[PDB]
Each structure stands twice: as C-alpha cells, then as structure tokens.
C-alpha cells in the first residue's frame, strides 16, 4: 500500500497473508467463511521455477499483523487443499481476476480472525464512495513490502473515467479505486487482498480484490480491482458460502 498508515492490531481481521513455500508473503486474501478465502487468480500461476497453482505450495496466515511475528498469539497458520481460479480468468488482460482458496482446516473465529461480509449480486459500490485497501505489499513502486499491515483510504472512480484513463484495458469486471492525483494506492504484494467498504450499519463488506495497476500511486493511474457483487453467485455455486 502506497500512501497509507500502520493498521491497528486486529483492525482488519479478514485480511489474510499468503506465503509460497520458501518465499514469504506473496499475496493477500480475505476470509469469507470458516473454510474459504477470496484472492486474485493472478497469484496462482505456475512459472518455470515454481507451481504457484498447487495448493500444497502455500501457507495462509490469519490474524497476522507483522510479517516478522508470524507466530504471535492469535495468528492462525493454515494450509490449502484447493485453489479455484475463475474459469474465465485471462492471463493477459487480467479479466475475471479472482480465485477461491479452500483452507485445509477451518479457521477459528476470534477477535483477530473474522470474516468480511459479502455483498449481494445487485449491490453497487457507488462512484465517490470512500473505501479501504489493506496489505503488506510495497509502500512505493519498485520499493519494499511493509512489515506491519498497512491501510489506505481510496475512492471508487466512475467506470467511463476508468476506461478512458487505461484505454483497451478495462472490462466491466474491473473497477478503478483510488485518486486521479495518485498518492494512495495498492501496489505489488497487495494483490489478492480485499477492499473493505463501511456499509450502512458500519459492518464491512468486500468491495473488490486487488488486481493490477500501471506502477503505484501515479497521477492518472488508479489501482484496478476485481468487483465482488458480480461474483456473489459464483462464490455460492463453488463454495456453498
């Protein structure tokens, strides 16, 4: 997260850290139920040196605050038994950049570990609305991951504005969130994490998944996120949640 601040401990108890074996934090994810996480399909692609698509190559850390204290009281470690990349995920455009991760054993709910609410399919996170991005990714483009979970406040951008700023790259699954002036944005390492939106009774709903952006926090280059409401029914069909 560029332009953000240290989160308070347990402030985002649905934010999860995904570590690939021998490599540390790679992507974020969100807890949605005792058994399931949401993340970005782009985190789980094999390459020639590592089968990032193989659930057995991962560890999920729930209730995590600081990457240098992964065994703190409250932190839960879990393996994965399944990764479900969206079937329409496109490598090249990042269309349908969403994945469901099945925990090998359920999470225990606690003050530090709690699911985010999911929005119904017809819900629309309106243009202009403030929402929160969180993660352990770079705090500057080309720059170092944060040890301590970061939070940043960003706003949903009009779809037409978005398409025009990033020509031939924005599909209706995508949403621009951030600022035309830059300054606050997600970045490398935040991939797969949730946008948290404070809704009408103050409960937090997931508004999006960190997907991509051109650099981080540049003027006229807001972050691009996978919309959640579009996938409510897919999440149900695949997970029972």
């Amino acid at each position: 997260v560029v332009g953000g601040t240290d989160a308070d401990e347990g402030e985002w108890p649905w934010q999860v850290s995904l570590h690939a074996l021998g490599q540390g934090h790679i992507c974020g994810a969100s807890l949605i139920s005792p058994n399931w996480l949401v993340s970005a399909a782009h985190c789980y692609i094999d390459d020639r040196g590592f089968r990032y698509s193989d659930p057995t190559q991962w560890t999920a850390f729930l209730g995590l605050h600081d990457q240098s204290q992964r065994s703190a009281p409250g932190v839960q470690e879990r393996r994965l038994k399944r990764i479900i990349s969206h079937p329409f995920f496109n490598d090249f455009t990042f269309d349908y950049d969403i994945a469901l991760l099945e925990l090998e054993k359920p999470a225990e709910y606690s003050s530090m570990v709690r699911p985010i609410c999911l929005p119904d399919a017809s819900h629309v996170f309106p243009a202009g609305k403030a929402i929160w991005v969180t993660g352990w990714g770079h705090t500057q483009y080309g720059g170092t991951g944060a040890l301590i979970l970061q939070k940043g406040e960003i706003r949903v951008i009009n779809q037409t504005t978005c398409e025009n700023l990033l020509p031939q790259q924005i599909t209706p699954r995508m949403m621009c969130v951030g600022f035309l002036s830059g300054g606050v944005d997600s970045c490398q390492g935040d991939s797969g994490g949730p946008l948290s939106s404070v809704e009408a009774d103050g409960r937090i709903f997931q508004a999006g998944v960190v997907s991509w952006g051109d650099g981080c926090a540049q003027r006229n280059k807001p972050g691009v996120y996978t919309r959640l409401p579009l996938f409510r029914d897919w999440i149900k069909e695949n997970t029972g949640v």
């Binding site: 347990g10 402030e11 985002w12 108890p13 003050s111 709690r114 999911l118 809704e199 103050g202 409960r203």
Partner: peptide
C-alpha cells in the same frame, strides 16, 4: 461478519 464485517466487524473487529
């Protein structure tokens, strides 16, 4: 869901 959705609170600390």
């Amino acid at each position: 869901c959705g609170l600390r």
